[PDB]
Amino acid sequence: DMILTEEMQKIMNLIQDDENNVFVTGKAGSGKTTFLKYLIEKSGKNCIVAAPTGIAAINAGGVTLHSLFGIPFGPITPYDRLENKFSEYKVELLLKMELLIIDEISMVRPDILDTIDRKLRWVYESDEPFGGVQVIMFGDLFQLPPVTKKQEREILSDFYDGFFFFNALVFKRTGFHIVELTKIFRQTEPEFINVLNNIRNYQVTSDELDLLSELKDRKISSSYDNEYIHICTHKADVEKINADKLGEQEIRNYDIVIKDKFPESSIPCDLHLKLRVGARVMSLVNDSLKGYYNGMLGIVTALEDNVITVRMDNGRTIKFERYTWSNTQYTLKDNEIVKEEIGSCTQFPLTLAWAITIHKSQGLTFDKIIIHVSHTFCPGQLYVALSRCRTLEGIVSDAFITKQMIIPEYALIDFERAYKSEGNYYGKR
Ligand SMILES: Nc1ncnc2c1ncn2[C@@H]1O[C@H](COP(=O)(O)OP(=O)(O)NP(=O)(O)O)[C@@H](O)[C@H]1O
Numbered sequence: 286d287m288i289l290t291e292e293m294q295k296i297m298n299l300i301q302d303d304e305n306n307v308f309v310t311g312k313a314g315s316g317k318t319t320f321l322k323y324l325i326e327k328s329g330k331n332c333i334v335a336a337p338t339g340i341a342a343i344n345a346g347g348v349t350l351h352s353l354f355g356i357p358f359g360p361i362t363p364y365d366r367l368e369n370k371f372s373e374y375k376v377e378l379l380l381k382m383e384l385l386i387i388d389e390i391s392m393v394r395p396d397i398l399d400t401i402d403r404k405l406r407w408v409y410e411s412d413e414p415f416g417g418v419q420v421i422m423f424g425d426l427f428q429l430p431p432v433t434k435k436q437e438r439e440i441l442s443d444f445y446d447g448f449f450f451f452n453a454l455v456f457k458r459t460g461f462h463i464v465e466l467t468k469i470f471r472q473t474e475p476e477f478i479n480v481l482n483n484i485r486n487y488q489v490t491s492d493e494l495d496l497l498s499e500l501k502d503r504k505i506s507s508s509y510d511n512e513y514i515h516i517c518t519h520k521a522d523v524e525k526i527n528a529d530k531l532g533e534q535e536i537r538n539y540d541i542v543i544k545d546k547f548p549e550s551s552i553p554c555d556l557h558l559k560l561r562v563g564a565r566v567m568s569l570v571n572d573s574l575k576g577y578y579n580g581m582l583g584i585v586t587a588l589e590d591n592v593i594t595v596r597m598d599n600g601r602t603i604k605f606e607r608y609t610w611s612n613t614q615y616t617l618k619d620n621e622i623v624k625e626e627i628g629s630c631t632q633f634p635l636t637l638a639w640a641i642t643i644h645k646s647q648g649l650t651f652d653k654i655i656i657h658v659s660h661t662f663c664p665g666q667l668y669v670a671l672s673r674c675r676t677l678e679g680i681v682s683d684a685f686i687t688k689q690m691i692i693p694e695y696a697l698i699d700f701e702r703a704y705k706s707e708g709n710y711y712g713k714r
């Protein structure tokens with residue numbers, strides 16, 4: 286099924302030289318996550334996969350950056366004392382790590398990368414950036430940026446020119462190639478692709494916003510008994526919609542089981558899943574053999590002790606059983622890095638889905654969406670919402686989309702221009 290595009294080939298070609306660090310990014314729905322999974326499978330026996338959040342790490346089959354490197358919470362400046370001592374076994378592990386793959390790099394503050402650099406140089410007793418470890422980073426700055434507090438920006442401001450990962454001081458001493466994936470798979474309509482790619486970059490014309498005006502529809506947007514999913518900025522609004530529609534009549538509760546070490550912030554499913562016949566639900570896992578994917582929507586038709594029957598919007602009925610997620614850590618076996626399970630959790634891979642937040646929609650595909658617009662969108666939020674849908678016809682909004690809803694981050698525009706001007710490379714050569 287998978288196509289290896291010229292851009293994907295370029296990435297694989299670059300990493301044949303173990304001195305090359307690489308940032309892989311791409312337009313919405315261009316195969317970043319799929320290609321990450323491909324690269325990991327090809328990445329050999331001294332590779333560690335990490336991500337900045339627990340759910341992202343579980344999804345990637347890796348570990349959190351915080352656990353791997355013992356990173357404290359909050360901003361660390363280059364001058365803050367790093368005394369966090371690793372265990373002997375952790376040191377032995379890191380000394381065998383030849384390649385570090387980081388997913389969702391776009392949400393990582395620059396000081397995090399500098400702390401990783403510092404700790405690896407400490408472990409390797411070396412002046413070489415990252416202790417000489419090869420680094421491959423995947424993300425999308427235009428969809429999934431960091432969220433920072435004012436106090437955090439104020440601490441970092443004396444040391445950093447900006448608050449994205451590429452602002453890390455380590456990139457005065459090393460650098461990375463960039464490959465952007467530009468073949469879009471999710472959308473197929475050139476007109477839709479063109480407006481999405483313009484919105485992505487805040488190069489959109491107030492004149493394209495007319496094409497989007499036809500998406501506004503009061504009746505559909507105010508309906509909750511269709512097969513649209515309501516995409517909202519705020520968790521509280523999503524919770525209210527799902528709770529209101531769930532109601533209190535004939536509800537069944539299904540409790541999570543957690544075994545051993547599995548931090549709550551890593552748990553990707555509901556702790557106490559409450560459903561009824563007729564509830565709109567979304568699948569949380571990819572299982573091609575069983576005929577569902579992460580993000581697939583349906584309606585509950587039956588509830589039993591160990592099976593939840595759901596008629597999916599594609600017409601297929603699926604008997605969902607409980608799914609088990611595995612929490613791992615890396616260890617050594619001989620001189621090779623291997624994974625070991627340290628905990629697990631078990632629950633039906635379903636969640637209520639009349640509504641979803643923009644944040645929880647990240648990376649997912651939908652056929653029919655209702656976008657609840659906001660006059661206080663943050664950068665990338667409208668783009669993420671629109672780019673969830675396969676086709677223009679599947680999108681409805683509750684009000685006209687306007688230029689006020691597209692907030693630019695000019696640092697990102699400048700970054701893109703900078704690396705392109707240097708042969709798709711950023712930092713020290
Ligand atoms: N190499 C590929 N060849 C063919 N189809 C692909 C390929 N990669 C991805 N797809 C298809 O495109 C869909 C979206 O891929 P995905 O890997 O989620 O992209 P993404 O860039 O991570 N999306 P997003 O995080 O929303 O910007 C997949 O579910 C596949 O159907």
Ligand SMILES: [K+]
Binds near residue numbers: 286287288319
């Ligand atoms: K594929």
Ligand SMILES: [K+]
Binds near residue numbers: 290291292293467468
């Ligand atoms: K290509």
Ligand SMILES: [K+]
Binds near residue numbers: 289294297298
């Ligand atoms: K290749």
Ligand SMILES: [K+]
Binds near residue numbers: 418419
């Ligand atoms: K090296």
Ligand SMILES: [K+]
Binds near residue numbers: 310311391424425427
């Ligand atoms: K990016």
Ligand SMILES: [K+]
Binds near residue numbers: 451452453454456457
């Ligand atoms: K920099």
Ligand SMILES: [K+]
Binds near residue numbers: 482483485486488
């Ligand atoms: K553009």
Ligand SMILES: [K+]
Binds near residue numbers: 517519522657
């Ligand atoms: K909202």
Ligand SMILES: [K+]
Binds near residue numbers: 539590591
């Ligand atoms: K039960």
Ligand SMILES: [Mg+2]
Binds near residue numbers: 317318647648
């Ligand atoms: Mg993705």
